[PDB]
Scaffold this active site. Structure first.
Site, PDB file in Angstrom:
ATOM      1  N   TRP B 123       0.966  -1.226   0.075  1.00  0.00           N
ATOM      2  CA  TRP B 123       0.087  -0.068   0.027  1.00  0.00           C
ATOM      3  C   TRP B 123       0.951   1.314   0.002  1.00  0.00           C
ATOM      4  CZ3 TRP B 123      -4.738  -0.620  -1.228  1.00  0.00           C
ATOM      5  CH2 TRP B 123      -5.743   0.706  -1.560  1.00  0.00           C
ATOM      6  N   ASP B 179       1.149  10.908  -0.074  1.00  0.00           N
ATOM      7  CA  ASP B 179      -0.033  12.313  -0.124  1.00  0.00           C
ATOM      8  C   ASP B 179      -1.192  11.479   0.116  1.00  0.00           C
ATOM      9  OD1 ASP B 179      -0.316  10.806  -2.596  1.00  0.00           O
ATOM     10  OD2 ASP B 179      -1.285  12.477  -3.500  1.00  0.00           O
ATOM     11  N   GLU B 182      -2.766   8.722  -1.835  1.00  0.00           N
ATOM     12  CA  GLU B 182      -2.216   7.437  -1.710  1.00  0.00           C
ATOM     13  C   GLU B 182      -1.318   7.086  -2.747  1.00  0.00           C
ATOM     14  OE1 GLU B 182      -6.265   5.348  -0.290  1.00  0.00           O
ATOM     15  OE2 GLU B 182      -4.708   5.264   1.382  1.00  0.00           O
ATOM     16  N   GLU B 183      -0.763   7.788  -3.496  1.00  0.00           N
ATOM     17  CA  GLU B 183      -0.091   7.599  -4.770  1.00  0.00           C
ATOM     18  C   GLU B 183       1.301   8.197  -4.857  1.00  0.00           C
ATOM     19  OE1 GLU B 183      -3.109   9.745  -7.353  1.00  0.00           O
ATOM     20  OE2 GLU B 183      -4.141   7.618  -7.603  1.00  0.00           O
ATOM     21  N   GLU B 405     -18.481   8.729  -4.012  1.00  0.00           N
ATOM     22  CA  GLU B 405     -17.024   9.179  -3.979  1.00  0.00           C
ATOM     23  C   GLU B 405     -16.880  10.268  -5.221  1.00  0.00           C
ATOM     24  OE1 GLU B 405     -13.490   7.210  -5.496  1.00  0.00           O
ATOM     25  OE2 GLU B 405     -12.548   7.259  -3.442  1.00  0.00           O
TER      26      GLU B 405
END
Ligand SMILES: *[C@@H]1O[C@H](CO)[C@@H](O[C@@H]2O[C@H](CO)[C@@H](O[C@@H]3O[C@H](CO)[C@@H](O)[C@H](O)[C@@H]3O)[C@H](O)[C@H]2NC(C)=O)[C@H](O)[C@H]1NC(C)=O
Ligand SMILES: *[C@@H]1O[C@H](CO)[C@@H](O[C@@H]2O[C@H](CO)[C@@H](O[C@@H]3O[C@H](CO)[C@@H](O)[C@H](O)[C@@H]3O)[C@H](O)[C@H]2NC(C)=O)[C@H](O)[C@H]1NC(C)=O
Ligand SMILES: *[C@@H]1O[C@H](CO)[C@@H](O[C@@H]2O[C@H](CO)[C@@H](O)[C@H](O)[C@H]2NC(C)=O)[C@H](O)[C@H]1NC(C)=O
Ligand SMILES: *[C@@H]1O[C@H](CO)[C@@H](O[C@@H]2O[C@H](CO)[C@@H](O)[C@H](O)[C@H]2NC(C)=O)[C@H](O)[C@H]1NC(C)=O
Ligand SMILES: *[C@@H]1O[C@H](CO)[C@@H](O)[C@H](O)[C@H]1NC(C)=O
Ligand SMILES: *[C@@H]1O[C@H](CO)[C@@H](O)[C@H](O)[C@H]1NC(C)=O
Ligand SMILES: *[C@@H]1O[C@H](CO)[C@@H](O)[C@H](O)[C@H]1NC(C)=O
Lengths: 585, 585, 118
Positions: B123, B179, B182-183, B405
């Site tokens: 992750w 960040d 999550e990238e 979302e």
């Protein structure tokens, strides 16, 4: 009061300039830009330059130069300020009994000779407030120069001097030293308070110039943290970290607030602003401590101005009222008044309750706006009280306008050193605050956050000899009776031997070994076996012979061999006259 | 707009509580106080708890609980906040792939399982904003408790949790991480900004409790110093210290300002306040980047609201408008409006000139007071523009009030994860700012002084397992299809060997070595040869058999010897179900 | 600083090496490759994809990179990253194929800075 403030205010500006080396009429042989503390040469001898007196007076003239009422020559004032800056460039390099520039220690020296030589004798050293006050004076003139397009002058001549002083404060603030009265060896409120301010101001100038000041970034919050230890709950204990025992009630505390006054700040207890509950409570205690003990205070009750001194236990010259004390008492009140007028309100709290009850026996804890009956009553009454201090000075100022160091506790006769530079400065500064003239803001509102815990971590500085100076036409009032000369000697000794010098003139004892001048060992080291003396009472032009000797620990006198050494005291404007000598075998 | 804000506002509060472990109807088997990110279990699977989503939503409910409009059960809200605090006490001790509590590293883990077990898979870790947002949520509830006489509860239960998170931020702020999307692996504006705020707030609470927080004393100015590197001259570059190449135009920058909004602060560029010239210029650039590229933005010119996403280069689920983006765009404007109304004025500068020219093509650089023609024209126009964003959300909210979302760039159909907790929170928070409801001030006006030079010196923290928790009657909505179990194995290997587990149920691959569950080596060390797996899709009550094997680097399958291991998944409210196993020889 | 010169280059023909830098967090045993629609990238055959190195992968930057050499000047191509999982499975990044055009003439460090597509 108005005519007397105009008259004594002109006189006070004149009294300062008269005592400024370069053109000052009372400074024969003094280098340009050096303030003498007083023209007194005997009983007491104050014919030296102190880093403190000189920096506080420079601040006074700089503020005058950018804002004030009577005739003023701005060109003459700017040249004097420039000459002050140049003189300080030179002094920062002078090795002295406190130490050298190389490791910073030299910068804490309290006073110097009028021709830029070091003072040799024992003294209350170091005094760590000095560099801080000088940086503050200098940053203030620097912000003026930047405003008028002379930023290259600030970075070329002024930043090198200021960076040394800021570095000194970042490294040595958490060491003991002597207080401003040159007596108590410990940690002083006045000293910590001005040290905190100097670093905050340095930060601001460093950013305008694109420079670093690491000390200014890391240290101020921890200096502020330590400054909280001086509040005892009822007043400000003036010295801590010391074996000394007095009450701690002392003008020192009032001067700390006066000289860190920020017109844009709120009544902040953390930085002890004049309108803060802590400063007001301390004001009452300070003043009350003198009411009983000076005969000239008879009948002057609570709510009326009284004549005040340094501290209640004082015995120096009898222990008397000081003109700068009586004036300082007023100035704190005038600062408070300005701040309340700016804010639109005053607050009465438990801590300040006794202070306010001297002007309104009825008063209750609460907040009071400009419109309210209590605000008018308290402020009009505090105003008259402050003026009452200036009225006492009026009763005791001589017809010629001279402001001595002291006036007598019994007779009010002026005494101790005449025409004290700092007395004149203290008059201008108090009377300016009465007229609502205030200096530039130093940024107390952004330097008032106390850390979660106190933990000191001072930083070791980097120090570099200043090189550039300002261009000036000033020379000096020619030398007459006082031309201090420094004699440096290399001579290895065993424990108990002391080095002296003798010679054929009065200051060297006319060849009497009982009357020879002692050399200090403060700079004697395994690396340089050095002794030195600064001999002061030598008239301009004097030719003399001298010879070194030791007093052996059995009492014997051992003279160096060879011929007598010869020297001729210079004339006109002497710059660091000296001799580098090696023992004659 | 008014009826829709009332209706969707009630719906949004309901959407948050539905997703809160304990009593939330959509959280089967979730521990009390854990927020799920969404009830989506597949395509995508968001049935986990994230430290960020959970902390931002907690902040939302705490502010709601002390100030807001529609029916609200305060008792139910306080219990949920208390359960949130308790759940976080437990999670701080959980070893995970980011590390352990012992050295702090564990605290940067992005997400956890719904039964308080660690997530095992690869992750985007670590995410260093997490501890900062949680400390901010927690300090806010703590200041409420102190106000209502419960200070002993704050120091006994809450300070141990907050001290770990503040220590984490003091030690690790100057390291890279992923960040908030999550990238991108680097340094993120949003992350540094919230880290700076959390430490400043910690300082204030530490003094109220009589505690130390050394990190809070030393670090904030240097965090602020680094935050200045994100301003590029035209907008805020969202990530730096990275190999990644995008424009840096990203909602990240807007969220940094929104979540460090201080109602008592001026338009400060140093802390990037919403009314600051830097934040306004960045607002225009951010919004404009979407006008061309989404088909549903056709014809929406400068001066009109548009539908906005994460960043213009986005391809996640197609790369679409996010509800929280469109709402965030409005909230920054509503924050700006409040601040200008408080201050009595707005300023137009060179940096902000393009922003303001979208509402008044005529506008010139200058200062404009509340009375002036320009102030009325600009503010009334900015107000309608902000409302325009809420109007677009209204066009694209389904009749049942669900906030997904995303909504589609071409059709505006809702997509990706349904009922995103943070979408609901973002609705309440934007609509609160429109109605001039603002959170407690964090003290930005005393944390805005940039150092002379940037020089980072983070401090190593001390970390201690929290022990105390709040008393609550909450249990859980019983477990159904998802009961995550963690398997810890000691097994020494050589380079190229990988450990898997197999077994007689679907989540373990029904004995097919191609379909076994991989164990991670993130916590394998010379000191503990440890492998672990968290297997999630195991229904409550399932009895199963399992066995470990290795895939050798030649492809061979090597099974452990001995009998199959047996386990029974628990029922009701599982707390960290797991097995500690040693390879069977 | 560099010296001033009139020299350019003999134009590129069959060999224009391009470097691809990818940010992608992994667990032990996962390897990153790239595939695409030209011969040097294996024409979409996962057995023939180009491996990326982990020599510069760190806790501070989860970085993988490949320098692919046998790409003629001017070639337009599509590419996509994948992992070989330690069980043998092929896991492709999501989203659209990435596009690149090999330069012509005198190429200076042609490359792409990429982030895994979710
Ligand atoms: C250098 O900085 C440190 C840290 O600010 C100074 O230490 C502090 O000194 C004060 C005053 O002496 C200490 O306060 C005293 O504490 C005792 C015992 O609890 C109390 O009974 C007294 O009434 C007073 O509050 C304070 O504890 C101490 N703090 C420390 C060591 O962390 C130090 O004095 C400074 N020294 C110099 C020379 O500047
Ligand atoms: C940890 O903290 C330090 C100090 O704040 C950070 O170092 C600073 O990083 C910035 C951004 O990379 C550097 O700015 C850049 O400088 C270059 C060269 O002059 C300039 O061309 C760029 O446009 C940009 O301004 C800055 O120089 C640097 N400061 C230092 C080393 O003192 C560091 O990035 C932080 N790292 C993490 C992971 O938080
Ligand atoms: C100005 O007035 C002062 C104070 O009255 C004079 O100073 C005193 O002068 C007498 C003269 O014999 C001395 O006995 C005192 O010791 C002096 N006082 C101090 C405090 O030093 C001063 O002389 C007058 N100035 C001028 C220029 O005439
Ligand atoms: C509330 O409305 C939403 C959106 O219209 C519904 O969510 C969709 O449900 C359909 C049902 O087949 C799915 O095809 C979509 O994938 C869902 N969208 C998303 C974004 O997940 C939702 O089902 C409705 N809720 C209730 C309780 O009826
Ligand atoms: C002292 O010595 C000097 C130098 O030799 C001589 O010129 C001078 O006249 C002497 N002064 C006296 C005896 O006062
Ligand atoms: C799996 O193993 C358990 C434990 O032995 C057994 O009770 C259960 O029925 C088995 N389940 C299957 C084959 O689905
Ligand atoms: C490969 O992809 C590029 C870019 O889409 C395309 O233009 C080119 O024709 C393709 N080449 C092939 C299939 O050889």
């Amino acid at each position: 009061l108005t005519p007397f403030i105009h008259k004594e205010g002109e006189r006070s500006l004149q009294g300062i300039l008269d005592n400024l080396g370069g053109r000052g009429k009372k400074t024969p042989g003094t280098a340009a830009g050096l303030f003498i503390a007083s023209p007194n040469t005997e009983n007491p001898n104050y014919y030296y330059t102190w880093t403190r007196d000189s920096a506080l007076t420079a601040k006074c003239l700089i503020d005058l130069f950018e804002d004030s009422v009577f005739p003023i020559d701005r060109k003459y004032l700017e040249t004097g300020i420039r000459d002050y800056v140049s003189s300080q460039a030179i002094l920062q390099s002078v090795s002295n009994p406190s130490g050298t520039l190389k490791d910073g220690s030299g910068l804490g020296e309290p006073k110097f000779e009028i021709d830029l030589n070091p003072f040799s004798g024992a003294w209350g050293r170091p005094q760590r407030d000095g560099p801080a006050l000088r940086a503050t004076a200098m940053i203030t003139y620097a912000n003026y120069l930047i405003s008028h397009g002379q930023k290259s002058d600030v970075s070329q001549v002024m930043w090198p001097i200021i960076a040394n002083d800021l570095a000194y404060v970042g490294q040595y603030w958490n060491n003991t030293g002597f207080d401003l009265w040159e007596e108590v060896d410990g940690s002083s409120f006045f000293t910590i308070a001005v040290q905190h301010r100097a670093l905050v101001e340095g930060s601001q100038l460093a950013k305008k110039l694109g420079k670093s000041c690491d000390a200014c970034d890391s240290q101020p919050p921890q200096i502020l943290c330590f400054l909280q230890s001086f509040w005892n709950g009822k007043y400000i204990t003036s010295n801590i970290n010391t074996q000394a025992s007095r009450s701690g009630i002392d003008l020192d505390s009032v001067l700390g607030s006066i000289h860190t006054f920020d017109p844009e700040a709120a009544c902040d207890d953390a930085t002890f602003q004049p309108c803060s509950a802590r400063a007001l409570a301390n004001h009452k205690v300070y003043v009350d401590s003198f009411r009983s003990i000076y005969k000239i205070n008879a009948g002057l009750a609570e709510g009326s101005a009284a004549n005040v001194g340094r501290y209640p236990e004082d015995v120096y010259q009898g222990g008397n009222p000081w003109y700068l004390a009586t004036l300082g008492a007023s100035e704190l009140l005038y600062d408070a008044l300005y701040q309340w007028d700016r804010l639109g309100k005053l607050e009465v709290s438990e801590t300040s309750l006794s202070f306010f009850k001297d002007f309104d026996a009825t008063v209750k804890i609460g907040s009071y706006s400009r419109n309210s009956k209590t605000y008018k009553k308290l402020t009009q009454s505090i105003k008259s009280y402050a003026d009452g201090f200036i009225q006492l000075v009026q009763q005791y100022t001589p017809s010629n306008g001279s402001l001595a160091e002291q006036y007598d506790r019994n007779t009010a006769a002026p005494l101790s050193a005449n025409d004290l530079t700092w007395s004149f400065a203290s008059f201008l500064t108090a009377t300016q605050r009465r007229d609502a003239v205030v200096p530039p803001s130093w940024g107390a509102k952004s330097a008032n956050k106390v850390p979660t815990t106190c933990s000191a971590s001072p930083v070791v500085g980097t120090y570099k000899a200043p090189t550039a100076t300002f261009s000036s036409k000033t020379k000096c009032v020619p030398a007459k009776d006082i031309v201090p000369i420094t004699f440096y000697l290399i001579e290895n000794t065993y424990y108990g031997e002391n080095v002296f010098m003798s010679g054929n003139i009065t200051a060297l004892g006319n060849w009497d070994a009982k009357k020879g001048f002692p050399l200090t060992a403060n700079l004697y080291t395994q690396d340089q076996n050095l002794w030195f003396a600064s001999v002061e009472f030598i008239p301009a032009g004097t030719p003399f012979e001298y010879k070194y000797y030791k007093v052996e620990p059995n009492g014997d006198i051992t003279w160096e061999k060879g011929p007598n050494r010869v020297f001729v005291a210079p004339t006109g404007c002497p710059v660091q006259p000296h001799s580098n000598d090696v023992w004659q075998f």
